Ligand binder design. Structure first.
Ligand SMILES: *[C@@H]1O[C@H](CO)[C@@H](O[C@@H]2O[C@H](CO)[C@@H](O[C@@H]3O[C@H](CO)[C@@H](O)[C@H](O)[C@@H]3O)[C@H](O)[C@H]2NC(C)=O)[C@H](O)[C@H]1NC(C)=O
Ligand SMILES: *[C@@H]1O[C@H](CO)[C@@H](O[C@@H]2O[C@H](CO)[C@@H](O[C@@H]3O[C@H](CO)[C@@H](O)[C@H](O)[C@@H]3O)[C@H](O)[C@H]2NC(C)=O)[C@H](O)[C@H]1NC(C)=O
Ligand SMILES: *[C@@H]1O[C@H](CO)[C@@H](O)[C@H](O)[C@H]1NC(C)=O
Ligand SMILES: *[C@@H]1O[C@H](CO)[C@@H](O)[C@H](O)[C@H]1NC(C)=O
Lengths: 189, 193
C-alpha cells in the first residue's frame, strides 16, 4: 500500500572494445553508481554493433573490433550470468579499464569473486552457453525502439540519454524519493 | 610556475587524512573521492595521508604507533603508506581503494596488487610495512597530520586547496567550481548552477 520509491533504471548497450563505451562505463556509469547506488538499477547488455548469423544451426557473431571483441563480449555475458549482480559489474568495470582485458579476467575475478574460477567463465564463453547468452543480447539490442544509432546507447527509465555527462544529474532528478543521497542535493539547481 | 609564459590552469588539490578502518573514511574514499576522481581526474591532484587519529611514541629509539581500531589498523596504515612509497601514484590510489572496499583487507592486498601493479609483490610490500621503512613512512605521516592548521577535529579530514571541507558530498561540485580553466569536464557543466 505504501512501497518505497523505485530506483532509476539505467541500461547500457555497449561492446567491449568501443572507446566511448569504455569511457562511459568506467568514468560515468561506474562512478555515478558509486555515488548513488541506492537509487540506481543498472543493466548491462554487451553486444553493441555486433552482427549475428545462423551458420549450420548455430549462431555466429561478427564484431566491429574483431574476434577479440566478440570473445570479450561473451566473457562479460557469462560473468553477468554466473556472478551476483554487483560482483559482475565490478569485475567487468575492472577488466574494461585495463590495456589487456582477456589477461586481467583472472586477477579481477580473484578480487571480486574468487569462488568463481576464470576457467569456468572461459568454458561458458567458448561454449554453447556463451553463444546462447550472446544471442539473447542480440535480440535485446535489436528490440530497441528506437533502434540504437551508435554505441554506447544509454537508456534512463527506457528513454535514450543524449548527453552521457548528464547521467548523475538526471538520476538524482528522476528519483522520486524525498530523501535523496547527499550528493543529489549538492548538485541540485 | 611553468611553463611560465602561458601555463595551463592548475588542478584542484585534495588531501585526505584518514585511517584504514574508519567507516566514514572508507565511505568517503570509495564513494566520494574515488568516483569524483574517475569523473574529473584531469583537474584533480589527490594526496592520501594514512594516519588519522593514530598516536605516536618514541619508546627506546624507535617510533611505535597506537591506532583507534587496534593493531590491524596500524598495520594496514603502514601497508598503504608503503604502497604510496613503492607504486606509481595512480596504481597506489587504485590499489588502496581496491583494498578499502573489502571485508578482509589484508588478504586482498595480493589480489588488488595483481590487478593494478603486478610487478610489485605483496611480499615486498609486507617487508616494508613490518620493517624500518614502514615505521619511517608512518612517522612522516604523523608529522604531516600534526602540522594541520587548524588541527583535524575528526577523520576523514579533507582539504580542498588547503581549506577544510566540512560537507564531503560537495567535493565534486567544489572541485568543478574551483578549477580555473574555461574548458571544464562535461560533468562540470551538467552540475553547474
Ligand atoms: C532491477 O531491475 C531488474 C530488471 O528490471 C529487476 O528484476 C526483475 O524483478 C521482477 C520482480 O518484480 C521479476 O519479475 C517477475 O516477478 C514474478 C513475481 O511477481 C516472478 O514470478 C517472475 O519469475 C519474475 O521474477 C523480473 O523477472 C526480474 N527481472 C530479471 C532480469 O531478473 C529487479 O527487481 C530490480 N531490482 C530492484 C532493487 O528494484
Ligand atoms: C601534485 O601535487 C604534488 C605536491 O604538491 C606535486 O609534486 C611536487 O612537484 C614539485 C615540482 O613540480 C616538486 O617541488 C620542486 O621540485 C623541483 C625539482 O623538479 C625542485 O627544484 C624544487 O626546489 C622543488 O623541490 C615537489 O618535490 C613535488 N612534491 C611531492 C610531494 O611530490 C605535483 O607536481 C602535482 N602534480 C601536478 C600539478 O600534476
Ligand atoms: C537456425 O538454424 C536451425 C535450423 O536448421 C534452427 O536452430 C533455427 O530454426 C534457425 N534459426 C533461424 C532464425 O533461422
Ligand atoms: C628517540 O629516542 C632516542 C633515544 O635513543 C633519542 O636519542 C632521540 O632523540 C629520540 N628521537 C626523536 C626525538 O626524534
Amino acid at each position: 500500500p505504501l512501497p518505497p520509491s523505485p530506483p532509476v533504471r539505467v541500461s547500457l548497450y555497449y561492446e567491449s572494445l568501443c572507446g566511448a563505451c569504455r569511457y562511459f562505463l568506467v568514468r560515468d556509469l561506474f562512478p555515478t553508481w558509486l555515488m548513488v547506488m541506492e537509487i540506481m538499477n543498472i543493466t548491462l547488455v554487451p553486444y553493441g554493433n555486433a552482427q549475428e548469423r545462423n551458420v549450420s544451426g548455430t549462431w555466429e557473431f561478427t564484431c566491429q573490433h574483431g574476434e577479440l571483441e566478440c570473445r570479450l563480449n561473451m566473457v562479460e555475458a557469462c560473468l553477468l550470468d554466473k556472478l551476483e549482480k554487483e560482483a559482475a559489474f565490478l569485475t567487468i568495470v575492472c577488466m574494461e579499464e585495463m590495456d589487456d582485458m582477456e589477461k586481467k579476467l583472472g586477477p579481477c575475478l580473484q578480487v571480486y569473486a574468487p569462488e568463481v574460477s576464470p576457467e569456468s567463465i572461459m568454458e561458458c564463453a567458448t561454449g554453447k552457453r556463451g553463444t546462447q547468452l550472446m544471442h539473447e543480447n542480440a535480440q535485446l539490442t535489436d528490440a530497441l525502439h528506437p533502434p540504437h544509432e551508435y554505441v554506447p546507447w544509454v537508456l534512463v527509465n527506457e528513454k535514450p540519454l543524449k548527453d552521457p555527462s548528464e547521467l548523475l544529474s538526471i538520476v538524482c532528478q528522476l528519483y522520486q524519493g524525498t530523501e535523496k543521497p547527499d550528493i543529489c542535493s549538492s548538485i541540485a539547481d
